[PDB]
C-alpha cells in the first residue's frame, strides 16, 4: 500500500538571535502542529505517532515528538519520539514515518522536525564527578557538533565549512559562481513570498511583544554579488584561496516543519488531499571531510530503486548546505543552465536557513507542493549531512 | 520478506558512577560493535545502516550510530543514527531496522543503543543570551528529563519514581511484594551467571583490565535485607514502597544486534534466532507511564493475532519492583507466570542502562527462545513520558 | 608625619547593563590611573603601593591593586593588594594608604577602588566535587551577596533595601522625603555639571569615542513622576516607601588619588588638598544597616576632638533615601545643613559603584573644601552588614 | 606605641578535598576565632576590628572578617574585613592591624586568615550578557588566579608551578635538592607534632562524621628522597628537564589563622601576655614570572628599615611554595646547610600545607612561639606572592 504526505507545512524561519529566539523548539513544533490540524480537520485521535527530525535535544524536551504532540493538546494516547540523522534529520523522520505505514503497522502518523539554534544549550561532562582535578569544560552546542561528527578517526577541524571549501578546491569552484547561487537563491525566495505562494506553506507564528509573523526572516530582495563580494571568507586566515564566506552559505536558524503521512485510503476518508507519494529513498556514507557530496551516492541510490534516472526527475530540491559544496553536487550531476530552472526554485538553505531538524520538512512543503503546482510528475529532496552522509527521497505527484 | 535477529550482543552492565565511569557511550557502543562483527565474521562493508537508540545524546556525538560506526574502524561508507523514544530506544530501533530491512530497502543493518549515563552531560538554556533578568539553571541531564518527558502540561516533579508510587497506590501493592520481586530478579540474574548463559549474551570490556560480568547483580540480596531499605519518597509520601533496591539503577552498557533476512544470513553463514512477528506502540498518562505495556503489548498481540496466553517467554523491563506489578495485574499473573518472565533477570538485577535496556532484553529473549525451544517471545517495556512498546518475536 | 592627598580623581559612572557595561573592573582601574599619573605628571616607580578597594573580586584580577599597576603600565617593582569593607572599602583603602605614609613605610601609594557590577561573576560551589547527589547550583555574584553579608545568624532577606524600610519604618519617614531628596540629590548632580565643575574630578574613559558624563544624573527628576514608581518591597509591605527612583543603583567606575607626605608632594610638584585629621569604624545591627555612618561619625569626631558643627562640608553616600534620612535625623539636620552636605550629588544620582564610592566622595569632599575655602569635611557611609566608616579630612 | 601579638593560634590545616571539605572558610575562621577568645578569655567588646587575609573571596562570606565574627558570637558591634595579597595575605592583615593599633586608632584588634581551597568557587564572566558570540568559560578559581595575577603584559600560562620551574632553571636548583627539602619539612613538621609543640598553636576542629580534629592532615613521617624520586614533574611534557612535582610543592589545603594584636600598655592593662612586637615590614615587586623571589628584595628592605641584617636574625620562617622556589631564595642569601637550623624548624607549606589566606598566621604562631622557647630576639616572616610581589616582616621577643 502507498504512503502519501499530506498538508506539509511549515513555521517561518527565524535567524539565529532573531524574531524566534525567545520560542523554544517546542513552541514552534507546536505552533505548526497546530497549523497542521486546523487545516486539515482531521481528529487529534487519528494520529498514531509523532516523529521529529531533532538535532540539538536536550532534557527540556526528552523524545521530543512525543512532549510536541502533549504540549499541543493531542490525546495523552499519541505516542511520539526523536529522530537524529544531522541534516537529514526531518526527512529520515519522514522515511521512517512512510515504512511503518506502508508496512500495514500505522494508518496515520505525524513526520516533521523542530530546530531552535537560538536556544541549544551550553553542557558540560566535567561536573557530575567535579572538576577538582581537571577543570570545567563548558560546550556550545552548535559549535562543538561542528568537530565530532566524524569522530576520533576522522577530524575536520573548521567542521561542515572546511569541508565545503574542500569541495571548492577540488572541483575549482570560483567565489563569483558561488555567491552567483547565493542570489539566484535570495531572488527566488523573495519572489516566492510576493507571488503568493508561500502562504500555504507557512503556519505563522504568535509572538509576543500580539504580532504574528508569517515572513521568513533570512531573504532579502537586494541581494547581488558586488555586496557578496566584500564579504571575507570565514578561513581566509589559514587559506589563501578561501572562497566561502556567511553570505554564500546557509546559517543557524529556528523554525519547525510537519506533515501527515498516511495511505490513500485512510486520506479519502477523512477527506485528506495527498499531494505526493513516496517512490524510493537511499542513504550513503562519505568521507566526513567531503561531507558534502553525499547527496549523490544517496540520490543514485533512491533513483536506482525507483527505476529512474536525473533526466526522469520534474522538481529537485537540494538543501544548499554552501554554495561551493551545492555546486560541487550539480558538477557531479552535469548540470546545464537548464537544470537550476528546476532546482530550488522558492530558495534553499542559503536565503532562507538551514534550521537543522525542520530543514527536510521545509524542503518537502516545497517539493510537494510544487509538483502540484506545475502539474509535474517527480520530485527529488535530498540533502548532504554533517560527519558525511546523504538522505535522498524521490517522491511522485498523486 | 522475513527480518531476522542475529548474534544479539550486549557489554556488561556497569553501575552509575562505576566500573564503567571512565568510559563514554561511544566507547560502549565501538566495543559491543567490534565484538559483533567478530563474533559473526561478517565484512565491515556488509552493514548498511547503524540505528541505535541513546537517550542522553550531546554534541560529543551527533547522530551516534554514524560515530560508533566510524569510531570502531566501519568505513565511511557505512550511515548510522540516532532514535530516541526514551526507555523503548533499543526495541525501537530493533524496530525501524526490522522494517527497512523487511521493505527491501536493505539486506543487513545493525540495531542497537548505547547510554552511559555515568557521563550524560549538565546543561543550560540560560548561557547564550544571558541570565542577567532570569537568573541561570544548570540541570542534570538524568533528573531533568524525568520531570520534563509529560511536557508542561504533565510534569511529574518526582519523576518516573513518583509514577511508581502511582501504580502502587492505585493497585495496593505491598513493600513487601516489590522486594521479593527484586530478589527473584537477583537470583536469576546471578543463576544465569553460573549457569554460564551470559558468555553467549556479553562482550567483554577493556578499561584502563577486562570486564564481562555485570556490576549490579547481588547474590546475597534478601527480603529481610531490602526491608531497611528508606524509600525515596518518604518525607512526601509516609507509605511509600519505592527504594533503590526495588528500582531498577542508573547503568552504563551498549547492545548490538544484526538485523537481516534468512537469505542473507545464509549466506554469511549466520545462525538467525528470531524473526520479528509484530509489534505495538501506545500513550498513556505520563504520570502513569508505567502501565505503558498493557496497551502496547495488546497492541502487537492483536497485529500477530495472538494472545498472551501463546506466548513463551516475557521480558519485561522492571523500571521499578511496583511499575512491573502492576502491570502483571493487568495481565493476571500467578507464581506460575513468572517462571516465563525475565527468567535471566531484568531491569532491577542488571540495571537499567537506558538506551541498551531494548537490546539487552533482546539478546535474552532470543537467546533463551532458542534455548528452551520454545516459540513465542514478547519484548515489552514502559517509556517515560507516558509510552509503551512491545514486539512478538518468533524462533526460527 | 602627615599624610595629603592629591588629585582626587574618577571615571564617569556607568549604569549596570549600561555605557561601561564591555569594559571589566581593570579596564575602569587603568584608565583612572593612568589618568591621574598623567595629570600628576609623576613617575611610575614613584608608586609604592596600589590600595583597592574591590567589593566583587575573582580571580580574573587577582590581588587588583597589582593587576591595575602592572595593565597601567607601571613597573614590575610596583606591589598591590585589595580591599574589601563593602561599600566602605574605597575610603578603607585611602586609610590604609594614609596609615602606611604617616608611618614613615612609604612616601607615595596610590588609593583607590574599582567595580563593573556589570561583569559580576556567576560562581558556583557544586562543581568540584561533583554534583549528582546535591544537584548543581551557579548564584549571582550580586544577588547573593544580598543575604549573606550579616551571616547566618542576623538574616536580612531582602538585603540591603530591607534595612532602608526598616530604617523608614523605624523614624517614621515619608515617602514624599524621601523622594524629594532624591530630586536634590539629581539637580546636584547635574549643576556641578553644567558648571564644569566635574570636568576636574573625571578621568574621561574611550569605549570601542570618549565618554566623560555620568550616566544617571537626569535634568528632569521631579518629586511628582518618583511618586509614579512602586517600592521594591511592596508586596510584602504595603507601607513601603524604597523605589528604584529614591535608591542608589548599580554601577560601574574605579577611583584613585595619590596619598604622599607634604614634603614629597612639594618636591614632585603637587598639590596636597587635604590631609586625614581622623577616622572611626563601627558595627550596628545587620537589619539597620544603614545608621551604621552615625556611631562611626562620633568615634571620628572624638578623635579629630571636633563636634559636628565644626564640619564644614559632609559627603554621605545615600545607599537609600530613607536610610540617609535616617542618619540626618539622628545628626538633628535643619534646611541649612542640606546645604553643606552632598552638594554635587550623591548615590542616588551618581550611582553606587560600591568599591570606587569612596573614591568618589572624596575627589567631590576634596575639591569642593577648596572651591568654598573651608576647614573640615566628614566622608561616611553604610556599610552592608551591618557596618560604618567615617573620615575627616582637613583643607591643606 | 609598640604592636605586639598574643596568642597566634591556628586550626589544624585540612588537605583539599580532605578532613575540612565539608567546613567553610568561614567555619574555619569562627573556630579559630572562639578558641583564641576562649584561650585568651579577652571580653568581645575589646575587640574594635576583624582584619583576615583572605585569596577567593565571593559572595558566600562578603568582608568575610565581619561575617566570621557575627557567626562566632561576637557582638554586632565588632566592624570586620577582607584583605588580598595573595600568598602574603595573612602577614598583610597582620601588618595593617598594627598600623592601625600604632597609630592611636585602635588599641585592640584580630589579625587573621581564613581558606577552604577545597570549596573555592568555579566562576564565569560570560554568564550575565550571554557568550552567543563569544562563548563561555568556567574557571577554577584556583588555577585561574595562578595564570591572570601580573595581568595581561606578563601572563604565566604555566602558573606558578611554571615560576617555580624557572627558578630552578636560572639558580640550576636539583631535582635531589628539591626532595632533600622537601624531606626535611617533612620531618620536622612531624617532629613538632610528637615533641607536643604544636598543641600550642592549635585549635581543635569540631567536625560531623562528631569528631574533634587537632592533627594536621598533610604531614607523613614516610617521606623519603627514595620515594619522592619516584614522583614525576607536572610539567614535564613541556619541559624534559622540569622538576617540581606535588611532592615537592606546597599543597593547596584549608585552615584558619587568629591572633591579637595590641599595644603594650593594653595587654598589661588586661593581663595578656606579648609574645612579639613588630619591629619592621617590607613590600616589594617582582616579575610575575620569577614571583618565587618575592622575599629577598622584601627581606631587604624590612631589615634595612630595621638597621639589621639577616646574620641578626635568630629564626626564620619562609613559606616554601615550592622547593625550587624556596632554594632560590635561600641561594640568594648564601644559606648554608647550617642556616637549615633556624628556617622552618616546625615544617613549612611543602609538609604543613598552603591554605592562602591563613598560611601568613600560621607561620607567625610558629614563629612567635619558637622566639619563646628558644629565648632568641629577633625573627624573620616572609613570603613569596604569586603576580610578582614579596612580603617580609621582622618580629623582636618580648
Same mark, same amino acid.
Given at each position: ?15 539565529? +538571535? +532573531? ?53 499541543? +493538546? ?196 477523512? +477527506? ?127
Amino acid at each position: 500500500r502507498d504512503a502519501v504526505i499530506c498538508e506539509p507545512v511549515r513555521t517561518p524561519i527565524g535567524r539565529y +538571535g +532573531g524574531m524566534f529566539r525567545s520560542l523554544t523548539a517546542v513552541d514552534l513544533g507546536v505552533t505548526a502542529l497546530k497549523g497542521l490540524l486546523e487545516r486539515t480537520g482531521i481528529a487529534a485521535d487519528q494520529v498514531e505517532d509523532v516523529i521529529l527530525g531533532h538535532c540539538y535535544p536536550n532534557s527540556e524536551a526528552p523524545a521530543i515528538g512525543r512532549v510536541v504532540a502533549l504540549d499541543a +493538546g493531542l490525546p495523552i494516547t499519541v505516542p511520539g519520539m526523536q529522530v537524529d540523522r544531522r541534516c537529514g534529520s526531518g526527512l529520515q523522520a519522514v522515511i521512517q514515518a512512510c515504512l511503518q505505514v506502508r508496512s500495514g503497522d500505522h494508518d496515520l502518523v505525524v513526520a516533521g522536525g523542530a530546530e531552535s539554534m537560538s536556544n541549544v544549550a551550553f553542557y558540560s561532562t566535567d561536573m557530575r564527578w567535579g572538576g577538582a582535578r581537571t577543570g570545567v569544560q563548558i560546550h556550545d552546542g552548535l559549535a562543538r557538533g561542528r568537530t565530532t561528527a566524524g569522530g576520533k578517526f576522522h577530524p575536520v577541524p573548521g567542521g561542515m565549512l572546511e569541508t565545503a571549501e574542500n569541495l571548492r578546491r577540488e572541483y575549482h569552484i570560483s567565489r563569483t559562481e558561488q555567491d552567483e547561487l547565493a542570489v539566484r537563491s535570495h531572488q527566488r525566495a523573495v519572489a516566492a513570498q510576493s507571488e503568493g505562494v508561500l502562504a500555504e506553506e507557512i503556519i505563522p507564528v504568535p509572538v509576543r511583544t500580539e504580532e504574528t509573523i508569517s515572513v521568513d526572516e533570512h531573504p532579502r530582495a537586494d541581494t547581488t554579488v558586488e555586496a557578496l563580494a566584500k564579504l571575507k571568507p570565514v578561513l581566509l586566515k589559514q587559506d589563501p584561496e578561501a572562497t566561502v564566506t556567511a553570505g554564500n552559505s546557509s546559517g543557524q536558524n529556528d523554525a519547525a516543519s510537519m506533515c501527515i503521512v498516511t495511505t490513500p485510503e485512510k486520506a479519502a476518508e477523512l +477527506g485528506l488531499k495527498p499531494l505526493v507519494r513516496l517512490v524510493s529513498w537511499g542513504s550513503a556514507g562519505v568521507a566526513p571531510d567531503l561531507m558534502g557530496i553525499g547527496p549523490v551516492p544517496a540520490t543514485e541510490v533512491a533513483l536506482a530503486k525507483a527505476g529512474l534516472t536525473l533526466a526522469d526527475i520534474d522538481l529537485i530540491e537540494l538543501n544548499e548546505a554552501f554554495a561551493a559544496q551545492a555546486l560541487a553536487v550539480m558538477r557531479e550531476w552535469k548540470f546545464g543552465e537548464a537544470d537550476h530552472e528546476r532546482t530550488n526554485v522558492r530558495g534553499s538553505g542559503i536565503s532562507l536557513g538551514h534550521p537543522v531538524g525542520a530543514t527536510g520538512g521545509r524542503m518537502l512543503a516545497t517539493l510537494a507542493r510544487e509538483l502540484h503546482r506545475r502539474e509535474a510528475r517527480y520530485g527529488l529532496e535530498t540533502m548532504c549531512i554533517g560527519g558525511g552522509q546523504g538522505l535522498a527521497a524521490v517522491f511522485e505527484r498523486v
